[PDB]
Amino acid sequence: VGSDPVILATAGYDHTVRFWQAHSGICTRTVQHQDSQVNALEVTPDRSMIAAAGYQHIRMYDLNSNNPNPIISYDGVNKNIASVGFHEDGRWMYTGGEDCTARIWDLRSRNLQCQRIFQVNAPINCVCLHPNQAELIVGDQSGAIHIWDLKTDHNEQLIPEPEVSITSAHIDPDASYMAAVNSTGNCYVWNLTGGIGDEVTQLIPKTKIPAHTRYALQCRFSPDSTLLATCSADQTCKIWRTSNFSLMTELSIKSGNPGESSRGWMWGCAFSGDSQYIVTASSDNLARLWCVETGEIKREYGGHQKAVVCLAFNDSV
Amino acid sequence: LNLQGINESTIPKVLQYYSAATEHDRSWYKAWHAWAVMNFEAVLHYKHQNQARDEKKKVTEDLSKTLLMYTVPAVQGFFRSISLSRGNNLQDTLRVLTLWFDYGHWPDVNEALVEGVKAIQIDTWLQVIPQLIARIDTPRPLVGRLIHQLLTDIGRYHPQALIYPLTVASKSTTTARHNAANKILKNMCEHSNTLVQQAMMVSEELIRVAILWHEMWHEGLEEASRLYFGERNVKGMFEVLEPLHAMMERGPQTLKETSFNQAYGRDLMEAQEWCRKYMKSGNVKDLTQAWDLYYHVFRRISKQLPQLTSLELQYVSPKLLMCRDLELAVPGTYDPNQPIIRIQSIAPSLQVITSKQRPRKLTLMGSNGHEFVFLLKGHEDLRQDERVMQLFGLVNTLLANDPTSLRKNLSIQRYAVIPLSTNSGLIGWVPHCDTLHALIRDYREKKKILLNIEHRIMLRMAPDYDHLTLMQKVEVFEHAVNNTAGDDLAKLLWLKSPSSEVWFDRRTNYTRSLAVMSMVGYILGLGDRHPSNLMLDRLSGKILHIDFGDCFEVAMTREKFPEKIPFRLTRMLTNAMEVTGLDGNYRITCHTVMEVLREHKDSVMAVLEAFVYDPLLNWRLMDTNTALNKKAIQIINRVRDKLTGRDFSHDDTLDVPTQVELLIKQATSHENLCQCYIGWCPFW
Amino acid sequence: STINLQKAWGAARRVSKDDWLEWLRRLSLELLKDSSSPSLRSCWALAQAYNPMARDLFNAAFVSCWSELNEDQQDELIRSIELALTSQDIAEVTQTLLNLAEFMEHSDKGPLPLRDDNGIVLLGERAAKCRAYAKALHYKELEFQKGPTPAILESLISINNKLQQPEAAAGVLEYAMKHFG
Numbered sequence A: 001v002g003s004d005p006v007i008l009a010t011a012g013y014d015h016t017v018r019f020w021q022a023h024s025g026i027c028t029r030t031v032q033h034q035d036s037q038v039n040a041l042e043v044t045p046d047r048s049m050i051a052a053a054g055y056q057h058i059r060m061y062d063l064n065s066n067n068p069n070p071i072i073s074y075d076g077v078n079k080n081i082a083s084v085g086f087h088e089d090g091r092w093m094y095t096g097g098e099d100c101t102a103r104i105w106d107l108r109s110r111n112l113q114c115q116r117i118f119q120v121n122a123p124i125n126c127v128c129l130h131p132n133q134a135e136l137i138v139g140d141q142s143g144a145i146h147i148w149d150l151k152t153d154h155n156e157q158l159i160p161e162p163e164v165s166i167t168s169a170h171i172d173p174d175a176s177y178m179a180a181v182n183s184t185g186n187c188y189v190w191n192l193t194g195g196i197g198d199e200v201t202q203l204i205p206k207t208k209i210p211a212h213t214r215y216a217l218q219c220r221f222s223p224d225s226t227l228l229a230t231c232s233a234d235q236t237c238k239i240w241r242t243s244n245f246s247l248m249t250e251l252s253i254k255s256g257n258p259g260e261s262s263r264g265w266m267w268g269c270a271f272s273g274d275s276q277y278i279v280t281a282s283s284d285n286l287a288r289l290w291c292v293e294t295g296e297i298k299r300e301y302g303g304h305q306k307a308v309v310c311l312a313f314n315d316s317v
Numbered sequence B: 001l002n003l004q005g006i007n008e009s010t011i012p013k014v015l016q017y018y019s020a021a022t023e024h025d026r027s028w029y030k031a032w033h034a035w036a037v038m039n040f041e042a043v044l045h046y047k048h049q050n051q052a053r054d055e056k057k058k059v060t061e062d063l064s065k066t067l068l069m070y071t072v073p074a075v076q077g078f079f080r081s082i083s084l085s086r087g088n089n090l091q092d093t094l095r096v097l098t099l100w101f102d103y104g105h106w107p108d109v110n111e112a113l114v115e116g117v118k119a120i121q122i123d124t125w126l127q128v129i130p131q132l133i134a135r136i137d138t139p140r141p142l143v144g145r146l147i148h149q150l151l152t153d154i155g156r157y158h159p160q161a162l163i164y165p166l167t168v169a170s171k172s173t174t175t176a177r178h179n180a181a182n183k184i185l186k187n188m189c190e191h192s193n194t195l196v197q198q199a200m201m202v203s204e205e206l207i208r209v210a211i212l213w214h215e216m217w218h219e220g221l222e223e224a225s226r227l228y229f230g231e232r233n234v235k236g237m238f239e240v241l242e243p244l245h246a247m248m249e250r251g252p253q254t255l256k257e258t259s260f261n262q263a264y265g266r267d268l269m270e271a272q273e274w275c276r277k278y279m280k281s282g283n284v285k286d287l288t289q290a291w292d293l294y295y296h297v298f299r300r301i302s303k304q305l306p307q308l309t310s311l312e313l314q315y316v317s318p319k320l321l322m323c324r325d326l327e328l329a330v331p332g333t334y335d336p337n338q339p340i341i342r343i344q345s346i347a348p349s350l351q352v353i354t355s356k357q358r359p360r361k362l363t364l365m366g367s368n369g370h371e372f373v374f375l376l377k378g379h380e381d382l383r384q385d386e387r388v389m390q391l392f393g394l395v396n397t398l399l400a401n402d403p404t405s406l407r408k409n410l411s412i413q414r415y416a417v418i419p420l421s422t423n424s425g426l427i428g429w430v431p432h433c434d435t436l437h438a439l440i441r442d443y444r445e446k447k448k449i450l451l452n453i454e455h456r457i458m459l460r461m462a463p464d465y466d467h468l469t470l471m472q473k474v475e476v477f478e479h480a481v482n483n484t485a486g487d488d489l490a491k492l493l494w495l496k497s498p499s500s501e502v503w504f505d506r507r508t509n510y511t512r513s514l515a516v517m518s519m520v521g522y523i524l525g526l527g528d529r530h531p532s533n534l535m536l537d538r539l540s541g542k543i544l545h546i547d548f549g550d551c552f553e554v555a556m557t558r559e560k561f562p563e564k565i566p567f568r569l570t571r572m573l574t575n576a577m578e579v580t581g582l583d584g585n586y587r588i589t590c591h592t593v594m595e596v597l598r599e600h601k602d603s604v605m606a607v608l609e610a611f612v613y614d615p616l617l618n619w620r621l622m623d624t625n626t627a628l629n630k631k632a633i634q635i636i637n638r639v640r641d642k643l644t645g646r647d648f649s650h651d652d653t654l655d656v657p658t659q660v661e662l663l664i665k666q667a668t669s670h671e672n673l674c675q676c677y678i679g680w681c682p683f684w
Numbered sequence C: 001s002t003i004n005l006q007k008a009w010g011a012a013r014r015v016s017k018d019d020w021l022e023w024l025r026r027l028s029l030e031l032l033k034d035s036s037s038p039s040l041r042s043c044w045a046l047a048q049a050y051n052p053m054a055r056d057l058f059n060a061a062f063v064s065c066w067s068e069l070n071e072d073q074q075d076e077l078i079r080s081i082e083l084a085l086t087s088q089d090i091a092e093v094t095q096t097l098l099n100l101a102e103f104m105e106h107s108d109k110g111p112l113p114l115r116d117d118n119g120i121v122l123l124g125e126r127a128a129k130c131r132a133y134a135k136a137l138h139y140k141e142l143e144f145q146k147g148p149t150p151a152i153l154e155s156l157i158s159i160n161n162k163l164q165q166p167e168a169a170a171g172v173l174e175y176a177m178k179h180f181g
């Protein structure tokens, strides 16, 4: 499936990853994951392997082979994997979650011995890699965000709102752009700058962008650094234009009959193409495709029986 | 003091003012109390100020001279205050005991104490004789002599109130303790016409009937088997088996012991031979054969225990069946101002209660013809319950003296707790209370409602819940909550009432009782509170709690499944209140109780400090956390923070309604409830 | 059995207090005369002479009759009850009917269909007139659970004040100041 960009991958509480065609709705293949649920999916820069974050393990699958074996399954962690990220050369992998550490694997080794790990004193909700630079941004349940220098172990501590946890972060490919969200209804945008020094600085506050959606669960930027999308536990998703952070549009799955409302949470989204489509997950048991430019709908994928949370796809081949 | 505080420049000025006030009116209790307390505070002040720097012996000599300057008149002050009042002298008595135990070895404090003690009515010591007892081992002969003389004098006048804890003390495994106890009991044998022997007879037979040979061999072999086959701890296994065989070696005395011996003795002796063969040769296979024998014994015992429903005294304790007016007071009551109710007879048989553990019901007949029902239970240390009941007594007294709490009839229901040994005792029976769990179970059964609907729904949505992340658990929890109306209790409270005029009052008592225990449990630090620990009074509507074990915040640090909720306030409990919710009666009652607790802080601290530093109980907390003196200090500081409005943050001082609102929010948020162990059912 | 209704029908003819008391007495006796159980029949001769004896067994007799009568007979009886409840402010009759309704609420048959809304509003008003404040409160909360209005909230304040519990009224006021203007 790695060879054809049309294939989208979804996962949820059915203990399987399903691969289907974005523009036809035809299901093409499945991968079994009976050991646990999947917390996150990701595709390597090599466009030929997909990772899945499960319970007490991180597992790799071959996206070209017809025998999706656990290629180099990293059996460890012992509690939870919040997310899995990859470095751009395909050499390193980054993990958050529990125990409260940011652990980095040197993926070519067959051992789980790591060359670096950062101790954090609350569970880690998200880990991001700075574009084109060996630095991590780690979001914790304590409300703190830490920046770690992968080359020196130096760091910076950011605690903009100690009362609430950080729930998600994503740093735009454009090194000057944000962002992260917390559990109480607001997104923060600070200017990215810095220089040479021991402390891994500097962020300079720019604007506070309220959502008023009780969360959010996921913050994500488009490939063209133009759009910012936010998904929450509520039945909506909002998209702002980064040139001024004004609201451009809004997506919603709310029921038209309140008696059957709150069918499920919008567990994240992803941009596809040059800001052409949004691939959305939903706990109500299907995936949906939306157009960012018009709001035109709808394509659906309902191969699952239980709630669907994770998204991944071959955006480029 | 309020404007400047306490420091080296203010102490003598406040003391001068208090001294002048005392001289102006020498009969006024408050003047003497305030002076004695200020001197006590000065003693702690100088000790604290030196240790604060030394740890973070010329100094010791400087402290001895300075503290003696303060301490002797502090003792005299407290003694005078005690002599000027009755009934409410508990706090002063405890402070005297504190100064005595810590500084009594100094000749000047000793002299002050001797003159003090001679001048005090002997009856005022009765309120403090679970604390003088078990300090008799103090390695300070001066204090030892004082304790022994005081206890002897007390026994001379009120032996009925003393014989119980001394009888228990005489069974202690520490040489010094049972020896001192024996000396005191020997004096009592002369003073009480050998009442001591009757007390020992009853205590020993009562202890023996609590636990049978079948139960001891069942648990013993279960643990020894775990050690042999699981851990492979052969040494530990032998250590576990050893006392069981040594116990059997004394031979049977009762009919049950004889039957047990006839049924299992041979096989146990063969097992002994196999173990000895292992010990001599090292042949573990001999232990395997011994374990086959133990297995057969264990299995046969496990078939039979569920069929035991009652015991007759003729087979376990014929000595009790044949009684006789024993000249002993009924264990649950004694009042020096009333006639003593004597034990007239013991019920011919005991009823066994089947559960994970098996308490037995006893009934005694007294000299007044009344029945007294006690619950006899082994395998537990009841001294914690005794101390908690004493605290509750104090709290009820403090509430009784506030007109607001007289108009709003607030109180805490208490129990009778009587330890018999380190692992057994009696609990008073409360005749009309029903466990909350049973009430809900029976309701759902009558209506054909499955007991676990919420759980089944959660599993159907996501049949892996136990291993999900926080936000997933929140989603599933809220879904299940929103799929059913949690108001079974609200319906039960109405269906069981004879009329609206009764229902209304019952609901009022329910709400106020819950608010009172919410605030007291918070200050105490009461831990695990789940549907099997709370009971409702079938007639009055008041709420009881029956398991005062993990009474401090050690119940917030268990290895698995916290323990985030400061007190239980579930949706089913809130729905039983007025249709407006928590606002109103509940919140206001919490405000009133917290204000009373804050106003009288020093009495509460005196009792809690006396408990925390008790060398025989404090270990229950030591095993969990940290130098015990440091942890005990941290615990006291935490209590003071709770009682001074500095619990949530040490950088501010919160008002009563602010603290209460913060506590309610913490106790209701879904994020904390979703983390609780399923046994502590968060959706009930 | 049908005779039970024939006396009930008198509640469109009675005018004076004595007329209504006689109506109630006649109904009470007829409910016993033709009862379905030998344990209730046999006291009729006694009840006829023992005045309170009929009263004390009124509810039990009614329930037995209730399970016998069909839908048309029950409709006629309910209409008779509604008329008795509205025709005149006689405390003995109003209190008897209120006690009957309360007893029926605890039965395995369910509440009387004193339409509309099972008579919750009507019984409430009558409870207020009889100074049965606990009942007025119960019925007011029952209608509250169907959706709040300012009228209900003010009624709750009034009843809570009459019962001498200012704290409950304060709770209602805070509710109003959180959800309503």
Ligand SMILES: Nc1ncnc2c1ncn2[C@@H]1O[C@H](COP(=O)(O)OP(=O)(O)NP(=O)(O)O)[C@@H](O)[C@H]1O
Pocket (backbone or CB within 6 Å): B355, B357, B359, B377, B380, B415, B427, B428, B429, B430, B431, B433, B435, B532, B533, B546, B547, B549
């Ligand atoms: N005063 C009391 N009055 C009536 N019943 C009581 C009373 N105290 C305890 N019980 C009941 O008798 C049993 C008490 O057993 P017990 O072992 O003491 O409680 P528990 O829940 O197991 N607490 P613990 O074992 O210490 O963790 C329970 O079935 C109680 O319902």
Ligand SMILES: [Mg+2]
Pocket (backbone or CB within 6 Å): B356, B357
């Ligand atoms: Mg138990």
Ligand SMILES: [Mg+2]
Pocket (backbone or CB within 6 Å): B359, B377, B380, B427
């Ligand atoms: Mg017990």
